[PDB]
Amino acid sequence: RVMTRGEGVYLWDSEGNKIIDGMAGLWCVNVGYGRKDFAEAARRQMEELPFYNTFFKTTHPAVVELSSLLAEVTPAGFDRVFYTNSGSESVDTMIRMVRRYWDVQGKPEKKTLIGRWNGMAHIEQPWWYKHGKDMTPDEFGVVAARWLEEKILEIGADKVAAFVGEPIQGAGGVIVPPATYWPEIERICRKYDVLLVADEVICGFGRTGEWFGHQHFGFQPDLFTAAKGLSSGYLPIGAVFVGKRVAEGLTYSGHPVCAAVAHANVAALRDEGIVQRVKDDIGPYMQKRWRETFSRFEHVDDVRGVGMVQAFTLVKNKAKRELFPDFGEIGTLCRDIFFRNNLIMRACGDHIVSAPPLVMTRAEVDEMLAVAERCLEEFEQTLKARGLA
Template sequence: GYHGSTMVAAKLGGFQGMHDQVGTEFPGFHHVQQPHWFDFGGDKTPEEFGLEAAAAVEKKILEVGPDNVAAFIGEPIQGAGGVLIPPTTYWPEVQRICRKYGVLIISDEVICGFGRTGNWWGFQSLGFEPDIVPMAKGLSSGYLPIGAVAFADHIIKDFFELGGEFYHGMTYAGHPVAAAVALRNIEILEQEKLVDRCRELGPYFAQALASLRDHPIVGETRSMGLIGAIELSSNKAKRSRFKDSGRVGTKCRDYCFKNGLIMRACWDTMVLAPPFVITKKEIDELVRLARVALDATYADVKSEME
């Protein structure tokens, strides 16, 4: 999970830069290897690697002690990390492990929630059932800031039956205007069947991105629904990275901007999240402009190719 740049939330996430920024160490937070096959899969199939990455969760639970682990938190797809789509074997196995040891699952749906992966929730697309679900961005489609947390029945039941106080008041909690915008946003998603549209366009978007795999510096393309990524590589056969992580990605991003395409660079991973109302014709244009930017980038770094 990534979301939150405040001290505790930053420590929960996996960005070392944020850890360094907030400084103070917090006890009780433990991290495991991210399930990113491109960088860490080696010679294993994605399915084999997914099980291996999930096994790291069990290993960590046993290392810390099951009675000391409250929950496992993660994004179904790690968005800001570079749209890291785990192998299909990963999340179901993580769920099996967590249920085995009585560990709650928290699915960070800030990016994946409200249709981005082709279902209302990322956990539906990845095949698991969480106990707690934080959400934000898609709740209002970004028109106004708002976030929420959903709890499974068996969790919320304890709030009522165990009694005591749960102090969670915040200055702008329950803001009526933001709540009204969120409700209307959800109505539009339902009325215009935008989540269905995202799911239906997903295969076309994936195929369009895949057409870039013949490019010399494209090591992999991947997507789910309408979120995707293009991996830049100095040797696609070895899945090698360029030196000075982020340098080539930033170069490619700048060429994208120059040619009228908004694309984010997460180090040397190019990230795309087009609007749900995009058309097939516009997807074709998106990919055409991406190739123009990739060509320009390749011309600059050709001498660095392995």
């Protein structure tokens, strides 16, 4: 099978089958497929001026225009932006910046960054279904955030540079933390004089209904990182957005052609009302319909989501919060059913996740959920037959 075409939320193959891309590429095709206007933006920039040499102390006008527009949609205080070619480069750049910041502050010892599972250290993820015991989600959020305080005290605050986290952990199975989590993380970071970094690789550019995930969860990072969601994936790009504290402690970056396409993308997300529509219209619709569709199944639990990112977990016994053995095997079984039915929704372990293009219509939401629901019927029937139910 070869892919021949994409438009909106759909991909087409050489056999003429229409496939619903419920993952928007790599969680990043937020304006959807088929933006021929972006092709023109790239063509024009490459015909005119695809380079800009550091010999000149000025900045390529496409990059200037992108930065000016980004400033309008990012939170106040993020006036320094460092462009990269990818999320990976953004993470590397962020790490170097955090460390340099502390060097400049006269604290070169402060070099370790702390992140989460699913000069490095890691803490457990705020996954209540697995780790919550008989705590309420609110109680658990405080406990899970305090794992950061524990790790800071273990390493020593004078050696810790920063905590880095995705507002919602995407690759981890869309683990949505309790409401109490990020405020406690923030208290802990500020208490121990540790920088706070939001990784917006998946939550960026409208995914949660706000422009950035950290805005939805109401925390104020010192920096945040972005990947190719910045261009809806149409060309490789990323960025590190630097807040006032770190900027003060610390011009040429950005491939001009990719910047021109990113500018067209961000302008579309704003001017065509796409992000606002997630917040006001399609987000709440998706979240309601997602929950109406999946909550009833015997082996589905923890149905969850915000804006246009959503998920659930396949489980052996809901009443016991008992997961299937060999976490991942059942998810793969379920994912194969979706794929056989020309629906792209992926599995992380036994979590099923979705992040369709933000432009998805209500009818398209219901179309996707109808296929998914039919697939889950088959999944449940298949479990029974294999004696795994």
